[PDB]
Amino acid sequence: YKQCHKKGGHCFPKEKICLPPSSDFGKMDCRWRWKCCKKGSG
C-alpha cells in the first residue's frame, strides 16, 4: 500500500507464482516474510 502501490501490487506469501513472471518484489510494505507482486502485461 505505501511503497509497493507506486509500482502497483498486492501482498502475497512467499510461495505462490507472480504471473506474468517479471515484477516480483521482495520485502516492500508487506510483513516480514511476505512479498508484493505486480504483473507485466496480462
Q: What is the CATH number of the domain that holds 30?
A: 2.20.20.10
**Distance in angstroms (rounded) separating the CA atoms of residues 1 and 4:** 6
Solved with: NMR
Residues 38, 18 contacting (CB under 8 angstroms): yes
Identify the domain containing residue 1 by its residue range.
1-42
* Count of the separate structural domains present in the chain: 1
Integer CA distances (angstroms), 14 to 26, 40, in order:
9, 19
Rounded alpha-carbon distances, angstroms, from residue 24 to 1, 35: 15, 8
CB 35 within 8 A of CB 20: no
What Å distances lie between residue 11 and 7, 21, 22, 23, CA to CA? 13, 16, 16, 13
